[PDB]
Design a protein around this ligand. Structure first.
Ligand SMILES: [Mg+2]
Length: 744
């Protein structure tokens, strides 16, 4: 049994290596240390100082290069005794200050132990290298094991959720969030791998597993932070019958980055599918789709990057086509998907020219025709809908001759609409195959970004930060409910409203919040960026404590989020909220001869947001349905963390890491925890380690509570620092570290 065989891969890769002995005496030391900042302007870079003496309210310590500093006891970050280095749950630490939390993570990360609990959270730090802990053999170890019987792992939280589903008869959710490159999608895939194995058996399992490469081909791209970045969020429901076997699955997607189709920043790529197609198509597909190399398409030849190191786009095309076969897209469906992809690239090569007054005409029709052929549309109808759309102006419908720039924007809008709708069609198609109208239970997995705070923040950042306000509020309420249950159950008296202001500033109706004011401006076609930002300042500047009008910028505003202030710029929000596409372009493509393209334009479930609503209103409603579903589940929270910004292994950077722990709720959770009784230990466990600290207890004394009390009395510990629970002693912060340091 690998859990008990210390030579196994389980022990080597997931545990701190255990020596011949764990006796208290091995770890005895008279040194006491403090974590301190060598430079006080760097709040989260620490070094270890040896305390050399103390007064009533201060410590004096030696810094690393020999200099005496002093610190008030009340301000000190004491270092946990060495036995605590490597513990599997931060809730086991006696000193719970920030550098002590970072130290335990780093100790573990130094041994390639990338998973560590913190109370309710599983903290997962990307190793940026392969560690072989996700094999079938590794799956089998976690089957049926309680959290406290096996090491931290995404498989163990997956098993606890599965058993809770079966035992409590309650749907479950796993919320997996964090920065780009942190590992969320890979962990999401491991949860699905795990459930398919413990609960599967089959062709349905295979289809559920193959849904993923399809959506990654279409919704992931190389960015500067991740070679395989997800540019859409997702919520996957894995469905079960009441006997606990997988019966189905459903996928909801969110915030697909449609703008990447038409523009990529330097060294970034477009969506993988465009390179796959070009690399992987047969000679006969290339000629039928009129394809050349990526250097021949404006939508793929601007960033300077068409290749990803270690990735073969033609081998990935094969993988994507195999996935499609297995889910059951027909050969004709697949061809039409590739026709849409090829036609977008052809659209992007249309070059608009001035032909007189502007004008915009097409002198070479080759790209127009190629696009028209592949989409099944009339090129003369496409041409006019692009450059001379008929516009309603009062009661008159008149063709307006657009100039080159508006013609080019309209073409871009068409491309983004084709891409967005195709993606939604793909999701619906996969759902039609996988989804069970009659599931008994589900485990839902959310894989989305945590808070996004960039150098520039725009409408999509406000959306995902609004989502993360809700999810952090949900976690807070959950944490409050479970802590009070724990204290109740052990009979111990100790005794997200916070998030509501920010949420109301964003989504309030009366008085109107930011999205309501955005939506109001959206019915006025001549409203501008300036009219919108002015309205926002008029309502909130100096009037709402979570908002800030900048000192100087005229296009930005600040929101105080859970994770700190975010500055947003409002350029183009009015356009983003309406997502406009000329009606003559809808009309052109509504009459397509292609059986996929017609759906993108004639099925109102795909072609339109529902009835009339804006993009913000739809985002608010989809978030409220998501929250409604999560509130019916027993949730589990996974916080993925990136160790540095360079995609390098073995380089865990304190400032990068701690900033994420502050943003994602981990440090706040600990700060709240550490105030009550954070260490709660099964009496027999306590006795088993500490019996030699007192006379006449019996390492296995049958009366565990009494023997615990014997040691506490013998050491004369202040009774205010502990509480006897029905099954555990509860300790205030620091107390257990002082017991660990007592004399044998
Ligand atoms: Mg991802």
């Amino acid at each position: 049994n690998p859990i008990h065989d210390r030579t196994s891969d389980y022990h080597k890769y997931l545990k701190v290596k255990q020596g011949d002995s764990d006796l208290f005496k091995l770890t005895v030391s008279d040194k006491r240390y403090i974590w301190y900042n060598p430079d006080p302007k760097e709040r989260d870079s620490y070094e270890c100082g040896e305390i050399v003496s103390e007064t009533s309210d201060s410590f004096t310590f030696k810094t690393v290069d020999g200099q005496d500093r002093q610190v008030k006891k009340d301000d000190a970050n004491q270092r946990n005794p060495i036995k605590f280095d490597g513990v599997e749950d931060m809730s086991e630490l006696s000193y719970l200050n920030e550098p002590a939390v970072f130290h335990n993570l780093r100790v573990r990360y130094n041994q390639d132990l990338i998973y560590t609990y913190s109370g309710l959270f599983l903290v997962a730090v990307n190793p940026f290298k392969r560690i072989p802990i996700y094999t079938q053999e590794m799956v089998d170890i976690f089957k049926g094991r309680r959290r406290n019987e096996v090491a931290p792992h995404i498989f163990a939280i997956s098993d606890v959720a599965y058993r809770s589903m079966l035992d409590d008869r309650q749907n479950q959710s796993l919320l997996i969030t964090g920065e780009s490159g942190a590992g969320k999608t890979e962990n999401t895939k491991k949860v699905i791998q795990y459930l398919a194995s413990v609960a599967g058996r089959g062709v349905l399992e295979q289809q559920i597993l193959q849904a993923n490469p399809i959506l990654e081909a279409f919704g992931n791209a190389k960015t500067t932070r991740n070679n395989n970045a997800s540019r859409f969020g997702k919520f996957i429901e894995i469905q079960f019958n009441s006997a606990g076997f997988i019966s189905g699955a459903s996928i909801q997607s969110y915030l697909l980055e449609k703008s990447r189709v038409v523009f990529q920043s330097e060294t970034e790529r477009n969506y993988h599918i465009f390179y796959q197609l070009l690399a992987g198509a047969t000679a006969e597909e290339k000629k039928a789709l009129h394809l050349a190399g990526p250097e021949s398409f404006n939508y793929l030849n601007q960033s300077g990057c068409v290749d990803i190191k270690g990735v073969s786009d033609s081998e990935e095309f094969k993988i994507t086509r195999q996935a499609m076969d297995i889910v059951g897209f027909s050969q004709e469906e697949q061809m039409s998907i590739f026709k849409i992809i090829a036609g977008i690239l052809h659209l992007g090569n249309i070059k608009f020219e001035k032909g007189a007054g502007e004008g915009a005409v097409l002198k070479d029709k080759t790209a127009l025709n190629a696009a028209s052929t592949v989409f099944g549309v009339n090129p003369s109808v496409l041409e006019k809908a692009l450059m001379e759309p008929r516009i309603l102006a009062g009661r008159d419908l008149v063709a307006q001759h657009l100039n080159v720039e508006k013609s080019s924007s309209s073409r871009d809008a068409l491309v983004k609409a084709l891409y967005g709708r195709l993606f939604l069609w793909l999701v619906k198609k996969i759902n039609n195959v996988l989804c069970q109208e009659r599931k008994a239970y589900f485990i839902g997995v959310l894989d989305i970004s945590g808070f996004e705070i960039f150098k520039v923040n725009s409408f999509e950042q406000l959306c995902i930060n609004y989502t993360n306000e809700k999810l952090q509020q949900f976690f807070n309420h959950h944490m409050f409910k479970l802590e009070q249950e724990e204290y109740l159950k052990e009979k111990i008296n100790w005794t997200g409203l916070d998030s509501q202001a920010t949420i109301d500033l964003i989504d309030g109706r009366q008085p109107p919040g930011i999205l309501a004011l955005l939506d109001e401006q959206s019915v006025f076609p001549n409203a501008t960026d300036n009219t919108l930002i002015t309205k926002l300042h008029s309502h909130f500047s100096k009037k709402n404590a979570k908002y800030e009008e900048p000192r100087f910028s005229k296009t930005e505003f600040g929101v105080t989020h859970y994770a700190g202030q975010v500055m947003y710029e409002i350029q183009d929000w009015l356009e983003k909220n309406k997502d406009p596409l000329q009606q003559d372009l809808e009309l052109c493509f509504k009459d397509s001869s292609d059986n996929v393209v017609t759906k993108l334009f004639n099925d109102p479930n795909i072609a339109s947001r529902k009835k009339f609503i804006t993009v913000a209103a739809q985002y608010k409603e989809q978030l409220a349905s998501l929250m409604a579903t999560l509130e019916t589940t027993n949730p589990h929270f996974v916080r993925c963390i990136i160790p540095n910004n360079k995609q390098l292994p073995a380089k865990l950077e304190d400032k990068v890491v701690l900033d994420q722990l502050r943003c994602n709720g981990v440090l706040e959770g600990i700060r709240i925890t550490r105030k009550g009784f954070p260490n709660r230990i099964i009496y027999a466990d306590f006795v088993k380690r500490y019996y030699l600290l007192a006379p006449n207890v019996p390492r296995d004394a049958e009366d565990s509570q009494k023997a615990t009390d014997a040691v506490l009395k013998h050491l004369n510990i202040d009774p205010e620092q502990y509480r006897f629970g029905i099954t555990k002693i509860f300790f205030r912060a620091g107390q257990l570290a002082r017991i660990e340091e007592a004399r044998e």
